[PDB]
Structure 1
Amino acid sequence: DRRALRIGVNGLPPSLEPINGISNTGPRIINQIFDALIRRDYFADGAKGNNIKLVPALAESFERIDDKSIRFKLRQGVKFHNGAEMTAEDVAFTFSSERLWGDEAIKTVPNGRNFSPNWDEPVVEDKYTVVLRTKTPSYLIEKYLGSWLGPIVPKEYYKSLGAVAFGNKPIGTGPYKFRELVANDHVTLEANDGYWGDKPTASTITYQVVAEPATRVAGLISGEYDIITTLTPDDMALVDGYSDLETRGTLIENLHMFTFNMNQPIFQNKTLRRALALAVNRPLIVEALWKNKASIPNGFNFPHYGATYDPKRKPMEFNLKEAKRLVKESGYDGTPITYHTMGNYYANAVPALMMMIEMWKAAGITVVPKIFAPGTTPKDSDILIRNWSNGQWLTDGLTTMVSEFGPGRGVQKRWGWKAPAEFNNLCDQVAQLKDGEERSAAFNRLRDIFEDEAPAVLMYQPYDVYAARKDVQWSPVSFETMEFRGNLNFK
């Protein structure tokens, strides 16, 4: 009675364990197998899949009891896919030092401490009540639990298999249960008719890897796929021309940028980093390669940040004479600077780079491409400039300016950014502060420091394009995932 759903995808994650599967390709599958305590309700109040409203999901109700603790009252009688009942022991295990943020845990789940606030050990008060708490103040616990950190795992099944084996045979409470995985080929899920929420509308969901965008578009035309992912604005006209097919695009909460190896003499000072930033003409790149669909953020600042989004912050400056002042004052002698890119792993990376090289040539800077094929692992010492992307994964300003560029993180520790003292003092404060005038003002000093220091240069917020058959009613969300709850109906 229910149709099977076939999705032609760019790739599969390295794991289906919630944290180890975090990637461009994992959440779209993980979001079906699992539930979190809190759910982001993207379509609430008629919003076009970009709402930041958080609602209870596996938690029946919850109350913030102090600046660092939340008492969760869980839904009772909810079952995981293996028949086990979801209790406070499973929720406590999900955010425990043993599984997620302990020294031993991060050797099997490397980003468990990185994608978490400063957690303290959960407290099980009774079978269905757990307090999730942070060691120091945190008014972001709710946002973290409604993010990709949130999926609740079964304690006893997860511990008998271990994180690695659990990632290949996952068990959750979600609307679709795991059926099979064929590495680098496909994942098939089947309807969970015992689901506590609404009945699943597809009998099965298959995520089939089709690496080439054109082969993926061909599969949708022929009837091999119902929905296809990872297209660009340049692919829209061909798909929209067909009467029974259409494109469904959205601005995603991701940031395309380029960053520097600041250990290197040429990039230890901010002077040349700023010159490269002040010489990039972002509207011309967005106009020529993204059909004007990509958005240029007005700083390290996006609407989904909520209380910490500043709509009055002015655009990032494009001043060629100021760049030329910095290139000359830096003592730059015309030595070629390489720009590493793994081809077009990020959409339009090579075309955007070729446009930026000519802009950089006007500021008296010589930059050369260094296109390395997938498989070639370049050494850190060989990197001057490299392209990068960052998923803006909390519905808050903390991610990624504080979470990636802050103290003790890769940009400063691995890539040698010597951030000013104020930046690392304000980073630790905004993690502990409550929303208001003080926190919002502190996010502007962090943004001002970021632009003047230029440890990275933000390019734009990419426009993600999906294509689907018109007889499949499903709307994209503004994040790198797929939501089918209240959003998947077959005509």
Structure 2
Amino acid sequence: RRALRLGVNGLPNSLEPVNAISNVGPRIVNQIFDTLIARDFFAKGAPGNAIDLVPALAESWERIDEKSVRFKLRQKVMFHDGVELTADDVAYTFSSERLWGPEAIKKIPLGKSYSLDFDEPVVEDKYTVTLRTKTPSYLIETFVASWMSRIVPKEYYKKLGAVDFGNKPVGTGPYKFVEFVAGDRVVLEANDAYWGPKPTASKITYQIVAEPATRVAGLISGEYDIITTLTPDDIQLINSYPDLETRGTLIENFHMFTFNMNQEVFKDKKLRRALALAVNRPIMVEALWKKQASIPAGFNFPNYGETFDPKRKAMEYNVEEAKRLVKESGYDGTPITYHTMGNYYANAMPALMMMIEMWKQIGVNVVMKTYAPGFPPDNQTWMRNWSNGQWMTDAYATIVPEFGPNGQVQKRWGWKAPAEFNELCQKVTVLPNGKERFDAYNRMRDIFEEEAPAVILYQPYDVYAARKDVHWKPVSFEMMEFRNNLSFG
């Protein structure tokens, strides 16, 4: 079998499933682990954007009450170390001790915030586990299909510990772990004891090539089979090669810039909203994205389904109001730092370059500050770029896990969110779908735009480039799927 060589924008600091949640982690962890329920992006001939939930580690599942889902596990499934997967492994993945409990903050810092109001799971037998919540939650199934729900082995994980497990992971996935050289590569080999769609590559190498130019030149050479995180400006050149092509898709993610509200200059919404109101997103989509990116109407995405508002007005663009807000704010004229990790996010640097000029024309002076892969101290950062993968078929993620009263934007970044925002966050968690929940999400979307804790830029069009003899198609998520989606020749 052929060894797959990948040229990537970055690598996660840990291969622990939850700690790996990023634009760079899922493409690796999806090969090491499996979930109970899997999303089949290619269901009913869809171009890698289907929302259909299929059985994976769980052969079948059933909803008992408004707060619990039972899982009937697939039998004789093995972890890479040779240990058999049981209800105890699933119970440990969703346990207080490891994920959502107070003691889990040392293992997985974002576990509690990204999790549902979980209760300790119920093991019924070797292949039967009930996942439950303390309060009603109709979000169990979507969470179970997410990047939060990759099954870890209890015994091996407990022996090693979260930090050590992240450097030497063991899962049930189609690709076992081989080696991890920080700031260099991640090597995975074919797991031929795999239960499902069998591995087609003998090995997979995730090689970091931080500079997109070096990455393209690498594919042309040809050092790599598939390269990630390109810009639609790379389409013309790559496609002009007979053996090469680009493969792109709009991903269920949004690029953004956020503030450190612990800093005196960003304590008031005045300057934050002024920066948001000066952002001309349509020219950014023309200049940098060549029409390929999508501008959402606020914290609203179609993957929310019943909680998506298609009648929602576009985010306000008002240069004159922005000027007024800068003047009303306490902003003196002191340069404000904007932190970026080169081009970890596609078009990160050209986007900031454009925005610095937009902000200059409103009275704000913004300065670029770059940081090497792996982040500066919180107190040393003012403005910074970020992204949020909308990991649920509901509006809960990411407005609640990231911007909620138990989330990192308020607790770590110091956003003094209005009481009304936090109250609605509690309702949407517990309530079923209806007018109350729909309007609750809409008022939160209105509060988010008024407060400006973060400024949504656009939905990036993910651009990959591969060798034509490598048959792989992208999915509408910040991950790569190779299950029934990888062949050579």
Q: TM-score range by the shorter chain?
A: over 0.9
Write the letter of the residue equivalent to 1:316. M
The code of the aligned residue for 1:204 comes to K
Partner of 1:218: 217
Q: Equivalent residue for 2:477? A: 479
Indicate if the aligned counterparts of 1:353 and 1:369 stay in contact, CA closer than 8 A.
no
Aligned to 2:415: 417
2:60 match:
61
Structure 1 residue 183, shift from structure 2 partner: 3.3
Q: 1: distance between equivalents of 2:327 and 2:182? A: 52
Q: SS in structure 1 opposite 2:186?
A: strand
After TM superposition, the score normalised by the length of structure 1 is 0.94
The Cα shift of 1:351 comes to 2.5
Give runs of aligned pairs for residues 309-388 of structure 1, distance below 5 A.
309-330=308-329, 332-363=331-362, 365-374=363-372, 378-388=376-386
Cα contact 1:392–1:400 (8 A) shared by 2: yes
For structure 1, which runs of at least 5 residues remain unmatched after alignment? none
What residue in structure 2 maps to residue 443 of structure 1? 441
1:75 and 1:128 in contact (8 A); partners too: yes
- 1:398 alignment counterpart: 396
Structure 1 residues 292 and 134, CA, compared in 2 at 3 Å: closer, same or farther?
Answer: same
**Equivalent position SS for 2:254:** strand
What amino acid does structure 1 have at the position aligned with 2:252?
E
1:390-416 deviation line (CA, Å, top 9, x unaligned) = 222223212222211111322223333
Q: 1:250 to 1:222 in 2, by over 3 A?
A: same
Is the alpha carbon distance of 1:176 and 1:340 closer, same or farther for their aligned partners in structure 2, counting shifts above 3 Å?
A: closer
**Is contact 2:61-2:69 (8 Å) kept?**
yes
CA positional deviation for 1:489 = 2.0
Q: Distance in 2 between matches of 1:167 and 1:265?
A: 37
Partner Cα separation in structure 1 for residue 71 and residue 162 of structure 2 = 25
CA distance in 1, matches of 2:480, 2:80: 21
Q: With structure 2 as the length reference, what TM-score do the two structures score?
A: 0.94
- Cα distance change, pair 59–305 in 1 and its aligned pair in 2 (3 A): same
Mark the CA change 1:276 to 1:105 in structure 2 (over 3 Å): closer, same or farther: closer
Residue 310 of structure 1, CA deviation: 1.5
> Counterparts of 1:42 and 1:157 in 2: how far apart (Å)?
31
In 1, are the aligned partners of 2:210 and 2:344 still within 8 Å (CA)?
no
TM-superposed deviation, 1:53: 2.0
Classify 1:380/1:152 alpha carbon distance in 2 versus 1 (closer, same or farther; 3 Å).
closer
Structure 1 residues 288 and 137, CA gap change in structure 2 (3 angstroms): same
Judge conservation of contact 1:257–1:389 (CA < 8 Å) in 2.
yes
Report the number of matched residues: 489
Equivalents in 1 of 2:480, 2:358: separation in Å? 37
CA distance in 1, matches of 2:315, 2:258: 16
Of 27-36 and 366-375, more deviation after overlay is shown by 366-375
CA contact (8 A) 1:19 1:112 kept: yes
Alpha-carbon shift at residue 213 of structure 1 (Å)? 2.2
Structure 1 vs Structure 2: percent identity of aligned residues?
A: 74
Gaps of 5+ in 2: none
Q: Structure 2 CA distance, aligned partners of 1:12 and 1:267?
A: 31
The CA distance in 2 between the partners of 1:358 and 1:215, in whole Å, is: 28
CA change 1:278–1:153 in 2 (3 A) is: same
Distance of aligned partners of 1:442 and 1:218 in 2 relative to their CA distance in 1, 3 Å threshold: same
User: Which shifted more, 435-444 or 146-155?
Assistant: 435-444
State the alpha-carbon separation in 2 of the partners of residues 170 and 141 from structure 1. Answer: 25
Alpha-carbon distance between aligned partners in 1 of 2:373 and 2:193, rounded to the nearest angstrom:
43
Whole-angstrom distance in 2 between the partners of 1:64 and 1:319: 48
- Verify the 8 A CA contact 1:50 1:304 in the aligned structure 2: no
Conservation of the 8 A alpha-carbon contact between 1:51 and 1:304 = no
> Equivalents in 2 of 1:98, 1:91: separation in Å?
13
1:408 to 406, 409, 413: 406
Equivalent in 462, 466, 471 of residue 464 of structure 2:
466
2:134 equivalent in structure 1: 135
Contact 1:343 1:371 in 2 (8 A): no
Tell me which residue corresponds to 1:110: 109
Kept in 1, the 8 Å contact 2:10–2:344? The answer is: no
Q: Residue 284 of structure 1 aligns with which residue? A: 283
Q: 1:86: how far off?
A: 1.3
Report the counterpart of residue 231 of structure 1 in structure 2: 230
Aligned partner of 1:12 in structure 2 is 11
Distance 2:154 2:183 in 1: 28
Deviations 1:50-90 (A, max 9, x none): 22222221111111111111111111122222222211111
- Superposed CA deviations along residues 143-181 of structure 1, whole A, max 9, x for unmatched, are 111111111122222222222232222221111222333
Cα offset, 1:389, TM superposition: 2.2
RMSD (Å), alpha carbons: 2.1
Following superposition, the deviation at residue 28 of structure 1 comes to 1.0
CA distance in 2, matches of 1:18, 1:468: 26
Residues 5-44 of structure 1 aligned to structure 2 (within 5 Å): 5-44=4-43
Q: Would the aligned equivalents of 1:52 and 1:306 in 2 still touch at CA under 8 Å?
A: no
SS class of match (2:64) = strand
